[PDB]
A paper describes a structure:
In humans, the CALHM family encompasses six paralogs, some of which function as non-selective channels that are permeable to large substances such as ATP. We identified the three paralogs, CALHM2, 4 and 6, to be highly expressed in this organ. The CALHM subunits thus constitute unique modular building blocks that assemble with different stoichiometries into large membrane channels. In contrast to previously described CALHM structures, where the oligomeric state of individual channels was described as uniform, our data show heterogeneous populations with CALHM4 and CALHM6 assembling as decameric and undecameric channels with similar abundance and CALHM2 as predominantly undecameric proteins with a smaller population of dodecamers. Despite the unknown activating stimuli, our study has provided insight into gating transitions of CALHM channels by showing two conformations with either a cylindrical pore of uniform large dimeter within the membrane that is constricted at the intracellular side as in case of CALHM4 and a conical pore that continuously narrows from its extracellular entry towards the cytoplasm as in case of CALHM6.
In each case, we found a heterogeneous, about equal distribution of particles with two distinct oligomeric states. The smaller particles are composed of decameric and the larger of undecameric assemblies, both of which we refer to as CALHM4 channels. In each structure, the subunits are arranged around a central axis of symmetry that defines the ion-conduction path. Both assemblies contain pairs of CALHM4 channels of the same size related by two-fold symmetry that interact via their cytoplasmic parts. In the plane of the membrane, the dimensions of decameric and undecameric CALHM4 channels amount to 110 Å and 120 Å respectively. The diameter at both entrances of the pore measures about 52 Å and 60 Å for decameric and undecameric assemblies respectively, thus defining the properties of an unusually large channel, which could be permeable to molecular substrates. Even at the constriction located at the intracellular membrane leaflet where the respective N-terminal helices NH project towards the pore axis, the decameric channels are about 20 Å and undecameric channels 30 Å wide. In our data, we find strong evidence for a layered distribution of density inside the pore within the presumed membrane region in non-symmetrized maps and after application of symmetry. This density is observed with similar properties in decameric and undecameric proteins in both datasets of CALHM4 obtained in either absence or presence of Ca2+. Collectively, our data are compatible with the presence of a lipid bilayer located within the pore region of CALHM4 channels, which could interfere with the diffusion of charged substances.
Author numbering:
A (entry chain D), B (entry chain E), C (entry chain F), D (entry chain G), E (entry chain H), F (entry chain I), ...: 4 to 83, 94 to 280
Amino acid sequence: TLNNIVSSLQRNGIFINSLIAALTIGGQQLFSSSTFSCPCQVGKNFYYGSAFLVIPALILLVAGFALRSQMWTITGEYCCPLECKLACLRFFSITGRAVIAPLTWLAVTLLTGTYYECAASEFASVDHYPMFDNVSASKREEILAGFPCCRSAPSDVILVRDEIALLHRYQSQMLGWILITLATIAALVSCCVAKCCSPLTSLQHCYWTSHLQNERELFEQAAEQHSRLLMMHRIKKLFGFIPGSEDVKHIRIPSCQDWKDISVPTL
Amino acid sequence: TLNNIVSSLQRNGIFINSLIAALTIGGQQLFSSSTFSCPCQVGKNFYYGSAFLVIPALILLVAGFALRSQMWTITGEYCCPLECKLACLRFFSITGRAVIAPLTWLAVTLLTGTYYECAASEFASVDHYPMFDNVSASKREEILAGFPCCRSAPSDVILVRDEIALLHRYQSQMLGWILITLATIAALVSCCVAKCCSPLTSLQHCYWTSHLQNERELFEQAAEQHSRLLMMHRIKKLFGFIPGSEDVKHIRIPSCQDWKDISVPTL
Amino acid sequence: TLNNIVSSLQRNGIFINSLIAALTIGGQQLFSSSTFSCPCQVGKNFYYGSAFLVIPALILLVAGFALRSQMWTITGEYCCPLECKLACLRFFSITGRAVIAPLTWLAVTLLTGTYYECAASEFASVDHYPMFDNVSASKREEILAGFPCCRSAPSDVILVRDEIALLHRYQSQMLGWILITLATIAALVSCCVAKCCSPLTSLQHCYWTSHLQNERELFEQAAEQHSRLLMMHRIKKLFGFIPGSEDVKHIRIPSCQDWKDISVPTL
Amino acid sequence: TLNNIVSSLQRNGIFINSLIAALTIGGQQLFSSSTFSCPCQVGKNFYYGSAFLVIPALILLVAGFALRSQMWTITGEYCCPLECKLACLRFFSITGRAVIAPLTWLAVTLLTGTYYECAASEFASVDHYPMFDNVSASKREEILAGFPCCRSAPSDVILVRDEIALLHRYQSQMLGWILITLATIAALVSCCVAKCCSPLTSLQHCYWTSHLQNERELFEQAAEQHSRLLMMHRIKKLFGFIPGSEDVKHIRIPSCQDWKDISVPTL
Amino acid sequence: TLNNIVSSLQRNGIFINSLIAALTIGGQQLFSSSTFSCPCQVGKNFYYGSAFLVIPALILLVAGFALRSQMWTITGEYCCPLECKLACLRFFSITGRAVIAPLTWLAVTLLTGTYYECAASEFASVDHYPMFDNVSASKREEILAGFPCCRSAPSDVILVRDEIALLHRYQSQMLGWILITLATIAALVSCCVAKCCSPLTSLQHCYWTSHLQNERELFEQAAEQHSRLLMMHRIKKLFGFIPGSEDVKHIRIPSCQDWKDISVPTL
Amino acid sequence: TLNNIVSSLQRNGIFINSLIAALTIGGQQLFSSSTFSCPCQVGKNFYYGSAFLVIPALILLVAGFALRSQMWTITGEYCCPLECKLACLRFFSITGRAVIAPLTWLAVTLLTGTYYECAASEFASVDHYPMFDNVSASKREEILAGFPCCRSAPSDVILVRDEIALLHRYQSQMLGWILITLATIAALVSCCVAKCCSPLTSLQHCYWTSHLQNERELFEQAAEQHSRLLMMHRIKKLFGFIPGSEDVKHIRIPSCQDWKDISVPTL
Amino acid sequence: TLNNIVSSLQRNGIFINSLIAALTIGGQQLFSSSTFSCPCQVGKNFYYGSAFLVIPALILLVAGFALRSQMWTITGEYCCPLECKLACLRFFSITGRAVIAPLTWLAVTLLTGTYYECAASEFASVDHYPMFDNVSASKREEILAGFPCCRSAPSDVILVRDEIALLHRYQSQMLGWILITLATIAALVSCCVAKCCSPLTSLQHCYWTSHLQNERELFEQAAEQHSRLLMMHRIKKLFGFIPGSEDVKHIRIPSCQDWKDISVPTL
């Protein structure tokens, strides 16, 4: 009874998407907890933030796109009427699967926010504080970029540090919620538009998806079996018996040329 | 039902590649934690870094290439039209499998970064620090190369030490992210180019892969069975019965020459 | 289903080689942890190092070579055209199996390095240290060879001790990596050369290996069964019945000479 | 399926030899840890060392030789052409089995070395030490033989004690490695010589071993069954029925003489 | 499958002998640890040692001899040509089984040695000690026999006590090793002599042992079954039915004399 | 398969005797540990010792004799040629079983010895001690009998107490070993004499024992079944049906006299 | 297979008697530990001892006698030649079963002795003690009866208390051993006398016991089944069908008198 429930969940898109999201959340948490430390350098902080904020998104997005077998076939159809719209719908479905990873990564990393504070710990507009009046500009940059990582200064400095940190965390979390709401509204309007521009009815679509999936599977199985049978026939012509046999009473010794013959694969 | 799922995962490339990457991560972590210590010598530091940074990459890459059985056959075809392009595609697929190990090793070792700081702990451009003004050049080299391993000096020295360490860790992690992004973009463009220059359709390719795999397997099985039968026939001609038999009622004692005859293997 | 997977792994060379390497690593670790202590004598240190460094390599190599049954048969063919090349290929395959143990022993013992420091704790070139200027030569040897095992001297002495130890550990680990890289490149070029000089195709080789293995096994089984049947016939001629029988209704009492007759084995 | 794997390992010489070696290692460790203490007497130390070093070797060697059933038969053939060489090969194989125990005992006891220091704690050549100049010869013997077991003297005495102990441990371990290497090289050259002087081919030898083993087993079984049947017939002649019977309808009461008749065993 | 392995081990002499030795070692250890304390009397010490040293040997030896069923039969043959030599061989085999217990008891008790020191704590030749010069002879006996059990005297006394104890332990262990080596060499030469003087071949001996064992077993079973059948027939003659029966339709009431008749056993 | 091994051990005398001995050892230990305390009275100590030393022996011996069913039958044969000797052999075998308990009780209680010291704590010959010179005789008895249980006196008194205790423990243990050796030698000589004076051969004896045992068992079973059948027939004559029946279609109501008839048992 | 071993043990008298004895020991221990405290009154102590010493014996004896079903039948035979002797033997066997409980209770309670000291803590003959000279008689009774339970007086009083307690415990244990030995000798002589005066042989007795037991059991079963059948027939006559039936096709409604008829049981 196992394989029944296995296939049932494997078809169920909700479970697969939820598992992907959970995996990305856990991986992000472990990653951030292990190998993250703000540089607290002079001008090389914003890059160290932006990298961790963005690059994983691009990587996971490209990976989630390119790993889908159907996308390669669609590109091959495209690379050097109704077929165009159907290709667009196919591509859109694969996109709807693949987008789940980068958006959830961005969401969790903005909500925890510990990345963003390092990303923009230098842009804090300081104009209404007593300790930043007389000090030099470069001295201000130095004392400003050192805030996130450590603290050893007097009380007022660590208090203004706490204040800047809270402000930046607020900004990060608001930006995260904005990203979530915009992503959701865009996904909804896009799915509705795709359902609108579809040339098929509410029933031909399901038939079509089943057609595609079962086509791929059956053709794979058939090609495998056919090539196996043909290679088996060549083997039997060479040695004199079918390999899957038993108690064979006839054996043909090969000639010093038959090896040369079987060398080519006939493609 | 076991062997079904075993073969299913064994065909699945994603699981194999993920397992390889996890194994390399764990092995690298154990290795670095056990047998690594910066030399803190005068000029013999950069080599001690570069070795651990590079040599495992070359070793694992050559091992992941040479261990693939098909690569030896392709080289034999090459060593002393359509066949050339097909060989190129075969070689490219094996490469796509083998490259996973060295790149993940480099990635994890640069991201942890503890190797790179030892690799280039001497190249730190020191020009704007108060304790490196009057001191001699060789004295500067000595005091500079001692930073990574230990600390016993006054406060200002350990502070400039912490600063150099943070700078170098930042450089290492940025270099790592650059390596990852370049590797990914190169892999993607290369796979797309390979799919472009392919002379086969979206269906002949799958048939072709199944052809290759099943060809290898079936020919192995057939050759084994055929040689077994032939050796069995020689044995029965010598001793007078088939070995796989039971309740044999006839035995032929060998002559002092038959041993000389069976000595040769007929190749 | 057990014996299926047992035979599958038993044919798989990768698993066997990996198990051998793991066993050697564990054994080396236990050995070194239990029965190793630097002599700290005057001139009898280098030998105590070199023994543990080398002798296990020779022992394990000779054991891994001589224990392979096929190597004895090949030597018998050699000891007092195509057969020569085939013998060379057979010997090379057995070598490829046997070399795994000594090289991994050397690798792990050099990487841990605790052997090498005792091996060459006397050759340290001391010329730029303040405490080795006025002291006598033999006094220098005495104070130099005592470094690895214990420490009771003032601070400067234990510091120069730590420095010599770090230098020697660095040298050991670099030598180990050099050994690994040279061994790998040599193994690769040698395997490629062997595949080049081979007179057989990519298919005759597999057939040939299966031929050898099944030949050995079947001949063993057949010889056993044949000798069993012949001895059974002699027994039945003597006592008057086949031993594997039941409810025998005839018994022949032996004569005082029949014992003398059955005494010889007929070889 | 149990008895299959049991017989498979029972034929496998490697596993049996490895188990013997492990058993001897464990037994030696327990023995030494429990019942060993240096006498620290005047002239009765060297014997107490040599006994534990040697006598177990002789005992285990004689036991491993005499316990092999085939060795008794070979001696009976010897005790009051081709047969001589075959006997030599048989004896050599049994020797190759039996030698594993004493050599591993010597190896482990020399490598731990705690025996050797007690064995030769009196022969230490003391000529360059300040506390052994004026003291009398017998006083020197007394103070020298007391080193291994206990320590209560001032610092310089316990330091020279530590030094003598380290020297002697070094000597013991080197002697052990020498014994191992010489034993291995001798075993290898001897096995090669035996394979050289053998009059049989690479195939007759296996047939011969199977002949010997199956001969012994089958003759044992047949003799047992035959004697059982004969005794059963005598019993049935006496009492009037076969013992292995059931529902016997005839009983013969013995006479006061039949007991006298059955008294003799007919040999 | 249980009874197969049970009989296999039960025939295997090595396992039985090893179990006997282990049992004697454990029993001796428990015994000595529980109920042993040196008397420290004047002249009644040597006996208290010798008893524990010897008497268990005699007891275990006589028990291991007399408990073997075959020894009683051999004595009955002896008590009031070839038969003599065969009896000698039978007796020798039983001896080879029985001797294992006393010799291992002596060995373990001498090696631990705690018995011997109490056995001869009075014979210590004291001539070169300062505290035994002026003291009276009986006073010397008193102070000498008190050494093993307790200590309350000044330092020099307890030191000479420790020295005497170490000397005596050395003597005990050497005596033990001598006993082991002499026992082994005697056993070997005796077994070889027995194999020499044997009138039978290398094959008649095994047949003979199987003859003896199966003879005993079968005769026991047959006698049991025959007497059971005869008693069953007498019962059926008396009561009128076979006891092992069911649904018997005829019953014979006994007479007041039939009880008198069945009273005798007919021997 | 259970009942097979149960009967096998139940016939095995060695296991039964060993279990009896172990049970007696454990019971004696628990008994002595729980309910033993020396009276330390004036003249009532020796009895309190002798009771625990002896009375359990007599009780266990009489119990082990009288509980054997065969002993009652032999006495009945005796109570108001060959039969006499056979009765003697039967009685001797039962004795050999029964003697194991009292002798092991005596052995363990003498070896622990804590009973004997209380048994003869008053007979200690005191003539060479300083504190027993002037004191009165009855005062000496009082101070002597108080030794075993408690101690509150000055040092010299408790020392002479320890000395008397050690002497008495030595005497107890020697007496125990003497009892063991004499018991063993007597048992051996008695068994040999019994085997000597036996009128039967080495085979008639086993037949005879099997005869006795199976006779008893079969007669018991037969008598039971016969009486059951007869009572069943009487029941069926009374009520009109066999009780072990089912679906009986005929019932006989008893008369007011039939109850009077069935009242007698017919013996 | 369970019920076989259950019946085997249930017939075995030894196991039943041993279980009864163990149960009485445990129960006595729990009882004494829970609800016992000496009254330490003036004249009401001896009764409080004697009750716990005796009354349980009488209770358990009467219970063990009256609970045996056969004893009631024998009394009925007795209550208002050979039969007399047989009744005596039956009664004697039941007595031999029943006596085990009271005697073991008395034995364990005397051996622990804590009851007897309270029983006779007032009868201690005090004539040779210094503190009982001048004191009044009733004062002596008061101070004497307070000994067992508590202690608060000066040292000499608690010492004479300890002495009286030890004396009384000695007396209790001796009395217990006397009771055991007399009980055993009486049981033995009585059983022998019963075996002597028996009119039956060594075989008629076993037949007789089996007769009695199987008679009781079979008659019980038969009476049960017969009464069940008769009541079933009456039921079927009333209602019109056999109750143990199914699918009955005929039902007889009862009349208002049939209930009056079935009211009587016919005895």
